[PDB]
């Protein structure tokens, strides 16, 4: 989440001397679909700051070793329909300043992953 | 090697008919019109080599004299009613290091493609008929 907007220097330089600079664009690439977050896309004079992956294709002629690729992104624009004071904080003052989240209901009593006995500690008390 | 022909431009015939009469220069041109095998590059390295079907595929050319039998035999064929189909072929004797050999270049399948083109010069005549045949299959041997 520090890294969110950009995930290439989260996934790294690949830094083995293996895997040739091909490698690398491909398991980055691959890294960053499979990833299923949104990532940073600069064209020139602006850079769009959630962008989704949508389409990646590679392609590679029989006449060039090289890897022809064309990738659309689509950008997650999302506002506020709450009242925010604080833009963006911290994380030491994120959840501090968070409204009352909600979460639906359910029914403990009709729970078994967890059907827990009493303790010992409490039958009697 | 030594090669001495005789008979400078090669006997063609077609149709059990031998041309006799053929215009100085470039009289006989056989060209084959396309590639013998054509091949293909993977994206690993290997190569794909296939022979064409077209392989063999050979336009003759003939430049024929302006009104010889020849070109009254060819004529002819122009203007038939349905495309005659020529079957023959170009034999050329020749002798290599003074030993008497012939040369075989059989010619199978053809029909007259592009018609000659007639022109009638004051200043310089060219009195030539070049009649193109495209036949299926020419073989060359020897």
């Known amino acids: ?87 963006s904080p911290s994380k030491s003052v994120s959840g501090k300043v968070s409204d009352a989240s909600n979460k639906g209901g359910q029914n403990p009593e009709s729970n078994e992953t967890g059907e827990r006995s009493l303790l010992s500690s409490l039958v009697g008390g | 090697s030594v090669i001495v022909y005789r008979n400078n431009q090669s006997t063609l015939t077609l149709n059990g008919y031998t041309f006799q009469h053929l215009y100085q220069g470039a009289a006989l041109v056989l060209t084959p019109v396309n590639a013998k095998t054509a091949r293909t590059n993977s994206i690993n390295g290997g190569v794909s080599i296939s022979g064409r079907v077209d392989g063999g595929v050979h336009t003759l050319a003939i430049m024929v004299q302006k009104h010889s ?16 189909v020529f079957d023959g072929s170009m034999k050329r004797a020749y002798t290599e290091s003074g030993t008497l050999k012939k040369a075989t270049t059989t010619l199978e399948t053809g029909s007259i493609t592009t018609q000659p083109t007639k022109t009638d010069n004051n200043q310089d005549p060219d009195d030539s008929r070049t009649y193109v045949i495209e036949f299926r299959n020419s073989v060359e041997t020897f």
Do not use: C, W
Not at chain 1, 24 to 34: G, P, Q, R, S, V
Not at chain 1, 43 to 58: E, G, Q, T
């Open chain 2, 69 to 84: 039998p020849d070109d009254k035999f060819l004529n002819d064929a122009k203007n038939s009613q349905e495309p005659v």
């Open chain 1, 1 to 87: 989440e520090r890294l969110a907007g950009k995930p290439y220097e989260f996934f790294g330089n690949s830094g083995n001397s293996a895997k040739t600079e091909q490698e690398k664009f491909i398991d980055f690439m691959e890294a960053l679909y499979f990833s299923r977050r949104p990532t940073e896309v600069s064209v020139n004079f602006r850079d769009y700051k959630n962008m989704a992956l949508v389409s990646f294709i590679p392609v590679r002629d029989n006449n060039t070793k090289d890897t022809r690729f064309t990738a659309d992104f689509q950008q997650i624009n999302y506002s506020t329909l709450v009242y925010t004071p604080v833009s």
